[PDB]
CSV table of C-alpha atoms in Angstrom, one decimal:
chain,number,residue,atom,x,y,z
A,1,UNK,CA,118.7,-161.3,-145.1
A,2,UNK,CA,115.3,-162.5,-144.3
A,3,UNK,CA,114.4,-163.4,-140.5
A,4,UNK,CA,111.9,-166.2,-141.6
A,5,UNK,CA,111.0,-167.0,-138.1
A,6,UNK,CA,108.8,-164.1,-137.1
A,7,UNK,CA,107.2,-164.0,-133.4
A,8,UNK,CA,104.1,-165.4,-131.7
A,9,UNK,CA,101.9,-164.1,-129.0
A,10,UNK,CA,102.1,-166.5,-126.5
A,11,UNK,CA,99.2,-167.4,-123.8
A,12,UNK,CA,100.2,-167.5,-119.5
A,13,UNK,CA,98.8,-168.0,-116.0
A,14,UNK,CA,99.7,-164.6,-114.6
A,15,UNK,CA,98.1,-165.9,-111.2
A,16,UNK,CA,101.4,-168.1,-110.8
A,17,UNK,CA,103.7,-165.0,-111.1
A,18,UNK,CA,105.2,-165.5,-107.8
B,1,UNK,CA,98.4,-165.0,-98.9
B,2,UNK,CA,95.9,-166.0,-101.4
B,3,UNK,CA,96.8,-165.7,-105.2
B,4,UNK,CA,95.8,-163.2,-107.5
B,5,UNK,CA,96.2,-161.4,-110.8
B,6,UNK,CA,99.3,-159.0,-109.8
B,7,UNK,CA,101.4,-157.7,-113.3
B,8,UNK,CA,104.7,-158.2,-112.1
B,9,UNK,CA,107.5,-155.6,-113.4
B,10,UNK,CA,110.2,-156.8,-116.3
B,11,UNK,CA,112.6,-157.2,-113.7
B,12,UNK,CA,110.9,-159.5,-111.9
B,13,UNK,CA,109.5,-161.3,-114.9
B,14,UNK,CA,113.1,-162.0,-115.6
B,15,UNK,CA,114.1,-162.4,-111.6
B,16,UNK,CA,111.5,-165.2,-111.7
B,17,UNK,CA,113.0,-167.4,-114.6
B,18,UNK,CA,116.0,-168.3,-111.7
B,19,UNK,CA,112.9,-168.8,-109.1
B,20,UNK,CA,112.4,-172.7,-107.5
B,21,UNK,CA,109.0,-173.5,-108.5
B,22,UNK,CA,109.3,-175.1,-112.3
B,23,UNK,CA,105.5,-173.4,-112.5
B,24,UNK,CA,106.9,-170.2,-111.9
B,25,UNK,CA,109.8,-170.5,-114.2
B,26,UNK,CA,107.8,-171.5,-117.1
B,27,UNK,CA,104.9,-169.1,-116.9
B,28,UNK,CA,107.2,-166.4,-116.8
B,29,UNK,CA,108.9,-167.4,-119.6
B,30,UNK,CA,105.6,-167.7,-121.4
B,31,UNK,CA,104.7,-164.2,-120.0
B,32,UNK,CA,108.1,-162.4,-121.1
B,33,UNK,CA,107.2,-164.2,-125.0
B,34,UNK,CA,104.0,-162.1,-124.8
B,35,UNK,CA,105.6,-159.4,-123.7
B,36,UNK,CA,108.0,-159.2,-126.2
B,37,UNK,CA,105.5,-159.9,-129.0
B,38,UNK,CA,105.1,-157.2,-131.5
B,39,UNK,CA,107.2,-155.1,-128.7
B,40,UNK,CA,110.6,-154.1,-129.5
B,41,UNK,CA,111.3,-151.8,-126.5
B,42,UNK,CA,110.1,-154.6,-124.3
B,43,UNK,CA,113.1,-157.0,-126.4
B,44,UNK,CA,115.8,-154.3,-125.9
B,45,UNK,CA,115.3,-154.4,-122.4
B,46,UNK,CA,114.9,-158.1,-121.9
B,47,UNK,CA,118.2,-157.7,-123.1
B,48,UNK,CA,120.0,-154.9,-121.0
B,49,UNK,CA,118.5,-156.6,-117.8
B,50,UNK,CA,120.1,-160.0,-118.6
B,51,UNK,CA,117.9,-161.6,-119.0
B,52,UNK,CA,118.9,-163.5,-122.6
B,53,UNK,CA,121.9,-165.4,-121.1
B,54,UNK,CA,118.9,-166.8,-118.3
B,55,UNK,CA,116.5,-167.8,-121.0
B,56,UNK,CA,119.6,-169.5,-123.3
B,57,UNK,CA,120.0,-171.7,-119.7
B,58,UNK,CA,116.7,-172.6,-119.5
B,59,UNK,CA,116.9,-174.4,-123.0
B,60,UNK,CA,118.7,-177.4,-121.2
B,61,UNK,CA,115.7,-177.4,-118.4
B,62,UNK,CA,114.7,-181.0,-118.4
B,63,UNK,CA,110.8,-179.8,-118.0
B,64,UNK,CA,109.2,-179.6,-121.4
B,65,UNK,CA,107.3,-176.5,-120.2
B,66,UNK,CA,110.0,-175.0,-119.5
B,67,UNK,CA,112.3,-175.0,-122.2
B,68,UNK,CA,109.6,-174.7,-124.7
B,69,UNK,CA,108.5,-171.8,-123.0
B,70,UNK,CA,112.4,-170.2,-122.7
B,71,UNK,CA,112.6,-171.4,-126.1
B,72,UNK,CA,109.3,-168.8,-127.4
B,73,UNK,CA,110.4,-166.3,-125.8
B,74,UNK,CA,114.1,-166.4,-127.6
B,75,UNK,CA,112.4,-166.4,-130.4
B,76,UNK,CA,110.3,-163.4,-130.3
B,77,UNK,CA,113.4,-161.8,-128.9
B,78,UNK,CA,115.4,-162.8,-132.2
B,79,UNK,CA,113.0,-161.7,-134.0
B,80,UNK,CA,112.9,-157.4,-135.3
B,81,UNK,CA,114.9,-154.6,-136.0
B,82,UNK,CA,117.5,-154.6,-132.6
B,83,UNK,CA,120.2,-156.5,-134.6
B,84,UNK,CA,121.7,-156.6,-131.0
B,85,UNK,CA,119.4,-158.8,-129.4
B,86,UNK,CA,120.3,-161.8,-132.2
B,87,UNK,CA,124.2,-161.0,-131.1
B,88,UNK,CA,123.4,-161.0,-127.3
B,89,UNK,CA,121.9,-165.1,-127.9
B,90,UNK,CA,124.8,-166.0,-129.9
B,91,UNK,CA,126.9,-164.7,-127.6
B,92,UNK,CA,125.8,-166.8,-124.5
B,93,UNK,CA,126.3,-169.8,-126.7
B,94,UNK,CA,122.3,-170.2,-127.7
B,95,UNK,CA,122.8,-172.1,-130.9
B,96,UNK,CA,125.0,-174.5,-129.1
B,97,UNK,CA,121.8,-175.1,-126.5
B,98,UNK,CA,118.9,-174.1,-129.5
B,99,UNK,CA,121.1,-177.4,-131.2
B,100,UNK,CA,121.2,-179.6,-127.5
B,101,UNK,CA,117.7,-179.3,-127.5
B,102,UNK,CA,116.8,-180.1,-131.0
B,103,UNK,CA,118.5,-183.3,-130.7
B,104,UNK,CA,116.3,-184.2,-127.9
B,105,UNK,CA,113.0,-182.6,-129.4
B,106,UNK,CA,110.6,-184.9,-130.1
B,107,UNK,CA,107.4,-182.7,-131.0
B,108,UNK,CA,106.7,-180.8,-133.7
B,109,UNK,CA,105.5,-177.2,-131.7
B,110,UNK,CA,109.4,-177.6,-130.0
B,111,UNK,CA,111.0,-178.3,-133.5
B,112,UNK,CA,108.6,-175.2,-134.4
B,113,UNK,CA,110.0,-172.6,-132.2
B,114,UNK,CA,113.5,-174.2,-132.2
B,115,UNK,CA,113.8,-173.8,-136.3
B,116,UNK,CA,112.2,-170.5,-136.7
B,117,UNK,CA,114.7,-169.4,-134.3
B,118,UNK,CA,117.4,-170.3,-135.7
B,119,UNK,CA,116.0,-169.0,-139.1
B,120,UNK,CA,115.2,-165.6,-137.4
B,121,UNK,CA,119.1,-165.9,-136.0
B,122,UNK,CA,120.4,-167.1,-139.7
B,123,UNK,CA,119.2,-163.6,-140.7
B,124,UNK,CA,122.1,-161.7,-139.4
B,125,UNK,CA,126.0,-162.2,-140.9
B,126,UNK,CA,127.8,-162.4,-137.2
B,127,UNK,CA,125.7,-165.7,-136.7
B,128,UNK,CA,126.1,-167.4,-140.2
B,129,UNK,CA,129.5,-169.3,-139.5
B,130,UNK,CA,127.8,-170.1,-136.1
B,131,UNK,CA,125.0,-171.8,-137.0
B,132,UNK,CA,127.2,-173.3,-139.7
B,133,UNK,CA,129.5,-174.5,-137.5
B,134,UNK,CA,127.0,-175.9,-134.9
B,135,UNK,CA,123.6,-177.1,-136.1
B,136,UNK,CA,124.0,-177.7,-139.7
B,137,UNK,CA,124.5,-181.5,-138.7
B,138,UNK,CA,121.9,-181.3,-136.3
B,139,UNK,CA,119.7,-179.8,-138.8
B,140,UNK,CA,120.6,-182.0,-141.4
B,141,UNK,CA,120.0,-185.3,-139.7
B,142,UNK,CA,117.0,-184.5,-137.4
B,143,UNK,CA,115.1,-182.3,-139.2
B,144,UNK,CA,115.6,-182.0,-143.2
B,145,UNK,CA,116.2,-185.9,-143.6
B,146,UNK,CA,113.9,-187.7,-141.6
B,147,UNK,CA,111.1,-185.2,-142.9
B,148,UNK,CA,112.0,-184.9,-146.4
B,149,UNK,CA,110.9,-188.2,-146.7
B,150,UNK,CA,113.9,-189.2,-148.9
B,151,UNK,CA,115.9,-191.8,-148.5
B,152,UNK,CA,119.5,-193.1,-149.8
B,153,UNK,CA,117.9,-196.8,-150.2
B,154,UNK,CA,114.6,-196.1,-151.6
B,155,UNK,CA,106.8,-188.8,-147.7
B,156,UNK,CA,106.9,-185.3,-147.3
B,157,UNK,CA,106.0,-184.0,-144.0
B,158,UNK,CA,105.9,-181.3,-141.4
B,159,UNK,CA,106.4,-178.5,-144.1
B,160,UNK,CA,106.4,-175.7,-141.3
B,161,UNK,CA,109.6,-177.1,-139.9
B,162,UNK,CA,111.4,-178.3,-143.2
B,163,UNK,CA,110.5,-174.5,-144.4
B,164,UNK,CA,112.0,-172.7,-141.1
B,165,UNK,CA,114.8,-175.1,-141.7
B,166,UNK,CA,115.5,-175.1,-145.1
B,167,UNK,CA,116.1,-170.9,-144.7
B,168,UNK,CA,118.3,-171.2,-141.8
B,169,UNK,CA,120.1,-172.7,-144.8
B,170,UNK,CA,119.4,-170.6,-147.1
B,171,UNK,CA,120.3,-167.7,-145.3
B,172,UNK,CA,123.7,-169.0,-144.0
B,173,UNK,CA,125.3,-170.0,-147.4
B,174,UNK,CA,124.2,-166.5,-149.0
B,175,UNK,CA,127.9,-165.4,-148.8
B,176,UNK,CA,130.6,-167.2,-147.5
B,177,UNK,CA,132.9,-169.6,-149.4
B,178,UNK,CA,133.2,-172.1,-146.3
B,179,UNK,CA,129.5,-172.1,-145.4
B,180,UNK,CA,129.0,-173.2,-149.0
B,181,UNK,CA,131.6,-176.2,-148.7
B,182,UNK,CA,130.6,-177.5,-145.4
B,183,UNK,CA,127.2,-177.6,-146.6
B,184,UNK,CA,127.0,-178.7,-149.9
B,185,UNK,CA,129.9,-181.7,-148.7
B,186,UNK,CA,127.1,-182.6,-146.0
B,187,UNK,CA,125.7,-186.1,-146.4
B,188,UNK,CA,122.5,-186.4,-147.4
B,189,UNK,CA,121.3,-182.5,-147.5
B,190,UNK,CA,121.5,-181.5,-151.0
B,191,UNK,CA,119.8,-185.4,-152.0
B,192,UNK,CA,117.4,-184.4,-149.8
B,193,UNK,CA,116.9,-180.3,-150.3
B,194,UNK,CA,116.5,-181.6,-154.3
B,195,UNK,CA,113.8,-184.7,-153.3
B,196,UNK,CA,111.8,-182.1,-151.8
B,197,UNK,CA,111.5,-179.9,-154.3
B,198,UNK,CA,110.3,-182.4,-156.4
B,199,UNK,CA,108.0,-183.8,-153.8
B,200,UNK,CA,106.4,-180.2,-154.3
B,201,UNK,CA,106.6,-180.0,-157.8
B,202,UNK,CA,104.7,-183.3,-158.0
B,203,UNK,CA,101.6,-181.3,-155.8
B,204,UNK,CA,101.4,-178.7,-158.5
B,205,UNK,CA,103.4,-176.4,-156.1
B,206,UNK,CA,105.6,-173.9,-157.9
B,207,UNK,CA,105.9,-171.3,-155.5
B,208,UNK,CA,105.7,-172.3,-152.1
B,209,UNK,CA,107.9,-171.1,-149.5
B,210,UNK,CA,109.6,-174.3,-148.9
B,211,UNK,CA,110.5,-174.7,-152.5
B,212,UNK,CA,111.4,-171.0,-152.8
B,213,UNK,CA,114.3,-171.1,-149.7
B,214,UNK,CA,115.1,-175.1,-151.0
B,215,UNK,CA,116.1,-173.6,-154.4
B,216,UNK,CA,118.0,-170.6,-153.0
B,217,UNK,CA,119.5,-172.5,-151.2
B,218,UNK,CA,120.5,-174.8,-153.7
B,219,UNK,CA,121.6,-171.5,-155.4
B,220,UNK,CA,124.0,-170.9,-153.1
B,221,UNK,CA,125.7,-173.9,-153.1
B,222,UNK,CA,125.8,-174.4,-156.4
B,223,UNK,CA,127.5,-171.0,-156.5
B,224,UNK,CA,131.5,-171.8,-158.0
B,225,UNK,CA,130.7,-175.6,-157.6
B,226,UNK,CA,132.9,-176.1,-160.4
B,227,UNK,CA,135.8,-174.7,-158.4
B,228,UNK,CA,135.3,-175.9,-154.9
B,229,UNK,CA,133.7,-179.2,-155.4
B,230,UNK,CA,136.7,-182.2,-153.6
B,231,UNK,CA,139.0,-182.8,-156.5
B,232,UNK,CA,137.7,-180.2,-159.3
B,233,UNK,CA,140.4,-181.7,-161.7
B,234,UNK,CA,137.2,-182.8,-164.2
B,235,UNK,CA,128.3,-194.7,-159.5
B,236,UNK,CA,125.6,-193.2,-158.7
B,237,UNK,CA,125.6,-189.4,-158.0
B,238,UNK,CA,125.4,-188.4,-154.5
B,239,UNK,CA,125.4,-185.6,-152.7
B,240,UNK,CA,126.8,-182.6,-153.8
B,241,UNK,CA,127.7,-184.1,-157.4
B,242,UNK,CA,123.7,-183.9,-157.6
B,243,UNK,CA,124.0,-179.9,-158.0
B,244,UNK,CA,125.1,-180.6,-161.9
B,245,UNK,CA,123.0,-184.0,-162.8
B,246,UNK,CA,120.5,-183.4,-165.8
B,247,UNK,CA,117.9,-183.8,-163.2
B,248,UNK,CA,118.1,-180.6,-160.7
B,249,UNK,CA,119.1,-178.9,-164.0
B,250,UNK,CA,115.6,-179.6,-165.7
B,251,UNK,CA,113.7,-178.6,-162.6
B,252,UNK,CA,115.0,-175.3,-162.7
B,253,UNK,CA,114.0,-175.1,-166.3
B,254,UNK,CA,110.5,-176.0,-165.3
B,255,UNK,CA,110.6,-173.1,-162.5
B,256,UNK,CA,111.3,-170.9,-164.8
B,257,UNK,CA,108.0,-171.7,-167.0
B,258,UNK,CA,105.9,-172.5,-164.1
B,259,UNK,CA,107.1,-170.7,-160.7
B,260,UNK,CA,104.7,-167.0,-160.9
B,261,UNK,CA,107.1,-166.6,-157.3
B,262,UNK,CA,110.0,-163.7,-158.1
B,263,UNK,CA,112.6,-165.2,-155.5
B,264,UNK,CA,111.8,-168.5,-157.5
B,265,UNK,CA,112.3,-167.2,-160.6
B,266,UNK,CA,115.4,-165.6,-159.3
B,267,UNK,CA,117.3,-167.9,-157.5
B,268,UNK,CA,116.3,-170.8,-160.5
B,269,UNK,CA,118.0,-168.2,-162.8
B,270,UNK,CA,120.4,-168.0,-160.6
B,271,UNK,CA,121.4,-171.1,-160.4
B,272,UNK,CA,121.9,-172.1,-163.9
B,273,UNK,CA,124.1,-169.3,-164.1
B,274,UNK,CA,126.2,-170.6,-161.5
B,275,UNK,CA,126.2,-173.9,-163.3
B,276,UNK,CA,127.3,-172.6,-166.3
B,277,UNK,CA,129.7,-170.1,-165.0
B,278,UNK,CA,132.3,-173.1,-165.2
B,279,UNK,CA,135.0,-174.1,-167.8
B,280,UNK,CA,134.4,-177.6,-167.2
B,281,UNK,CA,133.1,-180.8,-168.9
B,282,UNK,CA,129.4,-180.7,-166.9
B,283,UNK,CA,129.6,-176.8,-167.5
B,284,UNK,CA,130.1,-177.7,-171.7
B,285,UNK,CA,127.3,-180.2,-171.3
B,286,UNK,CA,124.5,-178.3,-169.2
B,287,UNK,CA,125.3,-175.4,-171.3
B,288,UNK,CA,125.0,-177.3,-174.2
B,289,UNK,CA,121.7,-178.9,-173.2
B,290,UNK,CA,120.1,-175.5,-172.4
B,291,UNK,CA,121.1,-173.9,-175.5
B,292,UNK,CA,117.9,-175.8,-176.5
B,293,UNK,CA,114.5,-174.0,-178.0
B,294,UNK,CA,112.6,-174.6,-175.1
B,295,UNK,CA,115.2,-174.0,-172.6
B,296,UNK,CA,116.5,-170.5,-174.0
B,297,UNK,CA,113.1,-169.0,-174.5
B,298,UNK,CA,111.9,-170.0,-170.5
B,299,UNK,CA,114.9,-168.3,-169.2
B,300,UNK,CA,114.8,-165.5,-172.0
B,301,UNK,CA,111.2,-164.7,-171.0
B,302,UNK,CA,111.7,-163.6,-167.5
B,303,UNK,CA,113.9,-160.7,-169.7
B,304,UNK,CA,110.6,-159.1,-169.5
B,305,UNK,CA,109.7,-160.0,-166.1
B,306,UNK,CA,108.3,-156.7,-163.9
B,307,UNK,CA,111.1,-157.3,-161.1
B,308,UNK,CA,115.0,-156.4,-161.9
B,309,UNK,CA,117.0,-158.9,-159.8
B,310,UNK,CA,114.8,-161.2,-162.1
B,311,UNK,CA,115.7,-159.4,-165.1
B,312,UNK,CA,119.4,-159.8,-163.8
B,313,UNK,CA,119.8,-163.2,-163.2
B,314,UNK,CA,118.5,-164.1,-166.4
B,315,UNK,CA,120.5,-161.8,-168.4
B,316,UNK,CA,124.1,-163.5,-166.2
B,317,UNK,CA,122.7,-167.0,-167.0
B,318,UNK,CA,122.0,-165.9,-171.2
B,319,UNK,CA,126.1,-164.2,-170.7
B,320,UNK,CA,126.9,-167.5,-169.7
B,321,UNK,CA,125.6,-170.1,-172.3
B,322,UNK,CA,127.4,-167.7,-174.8
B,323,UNK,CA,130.1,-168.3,-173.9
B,324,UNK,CA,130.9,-171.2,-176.4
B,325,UNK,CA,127.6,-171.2,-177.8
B,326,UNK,CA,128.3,-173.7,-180.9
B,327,UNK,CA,125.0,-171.9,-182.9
B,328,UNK,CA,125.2,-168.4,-182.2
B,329,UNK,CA,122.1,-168.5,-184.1
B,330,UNK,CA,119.3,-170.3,-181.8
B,331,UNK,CA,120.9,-167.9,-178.8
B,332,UNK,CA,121.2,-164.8,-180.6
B,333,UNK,CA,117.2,-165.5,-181.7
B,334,UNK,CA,116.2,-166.0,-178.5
B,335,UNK,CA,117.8,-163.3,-176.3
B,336,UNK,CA,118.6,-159.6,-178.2
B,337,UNK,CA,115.2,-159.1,-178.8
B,338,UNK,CA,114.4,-158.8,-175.5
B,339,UNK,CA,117.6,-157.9,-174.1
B,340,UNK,CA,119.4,-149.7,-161.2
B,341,UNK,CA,122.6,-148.8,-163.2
B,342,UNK,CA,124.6,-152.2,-162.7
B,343,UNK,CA,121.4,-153.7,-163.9
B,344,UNK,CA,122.5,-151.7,-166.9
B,345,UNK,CA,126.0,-152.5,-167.3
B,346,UNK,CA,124.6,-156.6,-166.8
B,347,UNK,CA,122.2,-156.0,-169.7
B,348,UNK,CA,125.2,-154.3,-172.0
B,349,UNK,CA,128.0,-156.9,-171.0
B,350,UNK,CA,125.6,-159.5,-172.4
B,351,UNK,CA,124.9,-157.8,-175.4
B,352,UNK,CA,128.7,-158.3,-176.1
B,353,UNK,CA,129.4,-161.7,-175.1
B,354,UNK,CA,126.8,-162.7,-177.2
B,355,UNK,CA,128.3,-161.4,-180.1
B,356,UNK,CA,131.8,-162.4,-180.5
């Protein structure tokens, strides 16, 4: 069937990797 | 050891979703949702390094941040063509957790992500009876209700989610018998699924995704009603008994003449078929009310509609009403004029049935 839901980009603070 | 802009590896991405700081936790799950986007190696291997069961824990995180942010990133990950990935959630018990913390949603953006996943999960078979068996309650009562805007005493909102929601439905009656009875026999969701679709109607909207996965839906479980309906030995209708009331009936009919949308068109065909499939009183009576001019010519039309599993439906839905067509003349009129290989055999069966 159908996956309606899809995906989205998303936005981060790599600078708080850590 | 002043901060900078370092790329960490996957590995640690995902090592950092167990780490202390909630700031960490959440930015990476943030980071592996961007990651994954539009990535489907990157998906795969969030799932061979383990890190799916992490993210399905993170859904009970108190922090909004955080489980939001788990909560994007399961759904890119349940989202493409590794049919694995959706199995590795389920398997950690994610639609128990995606349902924990839909009860406890209170914003939209978390309903969002929460829905759409669970759409994107509804897609595959192995999760059907899942869902089914865990969040069609949840979904019922928190989402399609409440939004829906009807109410068993008596406005629309939030389309997005009612949409996700309405195909996680959708999609998990599009087979099974017992998916079909546990819905349908749900309080309020058919009263409500139908109320909607009027709502859109009433907007000039034919063709919108919300009333296209509403009316599949309502396909579905209107699918051998006749048959698995409590007590099938055939004041006000509720519930299910609303699949075969003159009123859902009559909005199909003006699908048919107003929907330009081929699912639509479909899945209204569809479901007057199923409707009419039955030997029983409400099957003699919606028959008999659709072996009407205006009725048969609607439903008759889409016979020359450009897409086939249109053509089909309509041509199972025409079979049907002959059945004990009591003026083989207004039928006949309407559909031998106009009327893949089993398309074919569909087509020819109907031919017959018409004239006995």
């Amino acid at each position: 069937d159908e996956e309606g839901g899809g995906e989205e980009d998303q936005d981060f603070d790599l600078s708080q990797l850590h | 050891p002043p901060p900078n802009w370092r790329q960490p590896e996957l590995p640690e991405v995902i090592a950092m979703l167990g780490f202390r700081l909630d700031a960490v936790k959440s930015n990476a799950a943030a980071y592996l949702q961007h990651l994954c986007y539009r990535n489907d190696k990157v998906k795969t291997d969030v799932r061979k390094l383990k890190g799916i069961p992490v993210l399905v824990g993170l859904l009970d995180h108190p922090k909004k941040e955080v489980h939001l942010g788990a909560c994007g990133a399961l759904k890119n990950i349940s989202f493409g063509r590794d049919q694995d990935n959706k199995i590795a959630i389920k398997n950690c018990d994610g639609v128990p957790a995606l349902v924990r913390l839909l009860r406890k949603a209170r914003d939209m953006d978390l309903t969002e992500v929460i829905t759409g996943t669970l759409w994107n999960l509804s897609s595959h078979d192995s999760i059907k009876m899942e869902i089914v068996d865990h969040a069609l309650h949840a979904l019922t009562d928190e989402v399609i209700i409440p939004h829906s805007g009807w109410e068993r005493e008596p406005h629309i909102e939030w389309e997005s989610v009612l949409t996700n929601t309405a195909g996680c439905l959708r999609n998990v009656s599009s087979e099974r018998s017992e998916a079909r009875r546990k819905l349908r026999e749900c309080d309020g969701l058919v009263d409500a699924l139908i109320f909607i679709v009027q709502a859109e109607i009433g907007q000039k909207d034919s063709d919108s995704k919300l009333v296209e996965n509403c009316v599949c839906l309502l396909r579905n479980l209107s699918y051998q009603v006749h048959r698995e309906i409590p007590q099938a030995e055939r004041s006000p209708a509720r519930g299910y008994e609303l699949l075969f009331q003159p009123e859902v009936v009559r909005i199909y009919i003006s699908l048919l003449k107003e929907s330009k949308t081929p699912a639509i068109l479909e899945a209204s065909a569809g479901a007057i078929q199923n409707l009419c499939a039955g030997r029983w009183t409400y099957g003699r009576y919606i028959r008999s009310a659709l072996r009407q001019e205006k009725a048969l010519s609607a439903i008759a039309d889409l016979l020359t509609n450009e897409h086939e599993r249109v053509v089909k439906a309509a041509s199972g839905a025409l079979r049907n009403l002959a059945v004990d067509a009591r003026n083989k003349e207004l039928i006949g009129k309407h559909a031998i004029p106009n009327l893949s290989e089993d398309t074919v055999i569909s087509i020819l069966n109907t031919i017959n049935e018409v004239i006995a």
